[PDB]
Amino acid sequence: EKALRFLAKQTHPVIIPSFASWFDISKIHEIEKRSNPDFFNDSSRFKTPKAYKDTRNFIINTYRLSPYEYLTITAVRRNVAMDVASIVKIHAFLEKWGLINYQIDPRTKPSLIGPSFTGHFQVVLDTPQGLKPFLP
Amino acid sequence: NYEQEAQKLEEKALRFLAKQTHPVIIPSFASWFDISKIHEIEKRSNPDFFNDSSRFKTPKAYKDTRNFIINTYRLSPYEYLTITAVRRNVAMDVASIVKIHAFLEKWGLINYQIDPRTKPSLIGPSFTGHFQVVLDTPQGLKPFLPEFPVNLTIKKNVYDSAQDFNALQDESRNSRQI
Amino acid sequence: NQLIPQAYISNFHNRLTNEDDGIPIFTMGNAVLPDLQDQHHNPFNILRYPKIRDTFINGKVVSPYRLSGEAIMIPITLDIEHMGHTIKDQFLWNYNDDSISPEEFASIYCKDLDMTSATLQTQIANIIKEQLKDLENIAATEIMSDLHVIINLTCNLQDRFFEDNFQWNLNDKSLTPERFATSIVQDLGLTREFIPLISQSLHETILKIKKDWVDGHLIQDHVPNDAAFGYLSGIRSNWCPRVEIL
Amino acid sequence: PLNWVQGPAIFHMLTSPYTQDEIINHEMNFLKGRLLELQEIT
Amino acid sequence: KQKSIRQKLINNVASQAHHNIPYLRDSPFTAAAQRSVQIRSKVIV
Amino acid sequence: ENNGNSVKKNWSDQEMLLLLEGIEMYEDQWEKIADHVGGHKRVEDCIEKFL
Amino acid sequence: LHPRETLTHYLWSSKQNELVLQGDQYFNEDAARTSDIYSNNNNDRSLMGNISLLYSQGRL
Amino acid sequence: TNWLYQHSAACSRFNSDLFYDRVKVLLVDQQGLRDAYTNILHIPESTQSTTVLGWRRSKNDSPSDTSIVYETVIHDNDLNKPKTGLSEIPKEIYEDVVDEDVLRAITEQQNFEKCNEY
Amino acid sequence: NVFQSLPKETARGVDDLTRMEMALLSGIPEEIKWSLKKYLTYSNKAPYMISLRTLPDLLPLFKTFILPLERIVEGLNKSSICDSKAMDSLQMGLNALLILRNLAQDTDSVQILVKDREIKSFILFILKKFQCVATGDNKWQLYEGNATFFNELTHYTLDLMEAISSYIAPAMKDDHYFQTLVSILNYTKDRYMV
């Protein structure tokens, strides 16, 4: 009633992996019902399933509008009025099944700032009679 | 296209490698440790992360702060790493990060007071062999490829003997021939 | 010969009082560090970098200091003026753990600052004892009944003030706020020092709100304001984070 | 409380036999050459 | 001169022979002999 | 000659001659042998070549 | 009674005792006056690797 | 109308804006940072190859040689299938699935991901 | 200038006693061999350095080698020691048993060994198996090829029983130590053991 136009006008075409062929864009079913069951078994007044429908549609279509960039958690939090503790659940759920961060430019994914990786560094051993190299 | 993308990935991977200039000495009894996986000595000395008692102490956060401490030590080996320098960068409670720092200093993985000029050198294992460490592809330098198991040696390096393996001399002595 | 010893340099306090490095602890090619550039196996080459002969010239020699079913996290602020220079920082504390005493943390924290005045330790430990004993039965709560409060949040770090808005459910315990601040700083590209400083500025607000659920017991679970997309169907979100330099 | 102390002189002989009768003379020489060197410290 | 250096080499490599070679210091009888030479004498009363 | 020779473990006749000159000189003192070879060889290789 | 873990014991211990008896064959008269110990026997690796240690102890 | 498209386009512009912010400062302008507490150049983790796989042995060509060749290498399997992790899912969930070749594709992707070692 | 004021006492790495104490606490087997050899040398030549009165966190570090030797003694009636991995554990256990035998002639390293209620279970176990050898009972007949593994196993236990018996000075009626040794005395032919 409102998203038909939005899927029609400005959405880049659908790319979906083979182990996501069980996905249903219309309604939900038992996989999403048993993975995160808090939206269904009366957790609160807020977590009714129709809001879950609206948020999963908004996330997957927001990835449809730009399939070559990583959809981050903050950029969907700007216009989804829901718990951040459930935005994280739905976002990790949809990324986990390879739907909405599947085929992207790999230099778009946010990585946490940190020091370099020292695994290829050379270590030498402090043997009690010398300094033999550490070569397994 | 595959050869050019492989050469491109090799170039922009050697661009980010953190080349070694300082040797790192660990004590011989702490040779059980590996950067990648968690050993059973760490699982019985710090059980608070593996009992699933609290929510703020998972093995993933343990491994992240452990690799953080060891990687910020080995890039500057000559400098004594302190607790306050680590506490401002990692988000854990203070007691646990003090436990992990005292653990890593107990085994001599960090902060190992030694002067290697007053000890000899040895040849323990065999002489020859193409010792090649196998890393992973850093996801972020992968090719774009809008629609291939190529392995690439980044840095070749030869050593004549263990005495120049211990001091990081790569037969550059043809430059400085004394 | 010709090998550097593995330790014995602890040039940390001079970078605390460098006045170029933006450290808020004290008051009174074109790269900078060779962590991506080889030097062709001469250590002398590392003396061309201007922050590294700073740690060989101005360095000193240090001696190494030598040494429950549910954690309860309590944020602790620290604000002490002492001989012109001050100390303003913040850290969490595990109330259920007692493996380290605040006297021992005061002896450790005073040793990196290179004060060892033997009376800063007592003052720091008394402030920590005070802020722990003031909050012993306010962070041990068992909150139910779906509060879902709104949170404005600010962070002060050297005229680079962080501020954001979000809806929070403090009834489920799935989302660690340290993981939340990690997800923020991964996205905005900030330095790693904002990783504790947001979460340490969040738990306090959690026990500010928890406070009103227990002390005055004011429920006031009435319309957390939204933008008619999620929970409360107005017509069928709030804001976004930012870093403002004042 | 730590005290960095020099350890005792342990007689590690160069050649190591296994029968006792090939050892006792060397160990007597070690006991003499250690206790005479140590007696002057008192 | 190289004979006198080879004597000092062989009479200090073969003179240990049970602490460097792995398959000799792991035999029963060598380990038992090295263990039995280290027996401290019994204290009467 | 005075020039730096080729890649090591070649042992040209000049270096063999100077090694044997050093052994006739000093009878010990392998630092004073290894510099008399030319100083671009270690003690631990002059002893491995004289044996 | 049980033949498996005594034949494995035989195949282990006979091999180990053969290695122990063949731990002494390069210390003869005319096997040490010649040159086929020091040169080219990196296959052996046992001696001529102690020379980095024995000079550092002053023995020579 | 004109609500939901406007909101989703604003989300995508905000996403690309955060990307163009985070890519210039860290990697392009000065290629890293500098921690003030420790003299360590911070770098984004995506260019760093987090794990380390097994070792490999060999021998040099000429016998009776003493030289050591220490080196590194990269490795991956096929470098095109991504790492959308299905192994962090228990095996009791996806057994009321609709098809059987869907189950085969899930097991194929999981057996691909468990071949991180070589 | 900063590389001139190094403390001379710590510029060799760690000291050897902490090296020996950490080497056993790890799991590297050759470094365990080195640590036990050096503990044996220091126990023979200067036992007061490894006096249990001084270093209290050292006796469980030997219990963790001596206590899994009971399974080996149980399985020693057949040719159990097949590979080169169980034998190394056997030799480490016998060497740690010798170290605790050598520390038990001190009269201050002895009361800590007596007050432990688990070393005496091992002594009683070894003596019960040697009583099964000395009587000739059909249960647990000794395999002869393991006999040199067992013989020096039972000379290092009696020397503990010779040292701790003064602290078992109240003798009961139906005692197992007294019954076992009075069974052993009829069998043996060693002057030292008698």
Tab-separated table of C-alpha atoms in Angstrom, chain C residues 13-14 49 68 74 89 105-106 118 127 182 185:
chain	number	residue	atom	x	y	z
C	13	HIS	CA	54.768	10.748	32.056
C	14	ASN	CA	56.505	13.101	29.623
C	49	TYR	CA	61.287	10.025	13.478
C	68	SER	CA	31.268	-14.449	42.684
C	74	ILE	CA	29.838	0.790	38.772
C	89	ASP	CA	39.396	10.581	34.496
C	105	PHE	CA	44.864	0.330	42.350
C	106	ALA	CA	45.897	3.644	43.897
C	118	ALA	CA	52.385	8.220	49.502
C	127	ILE	CA	37.346	8.610	46.988
C	182	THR	CA	32.085	-0.304	19.961
C	185	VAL	CA	33.069	4.126	17.194
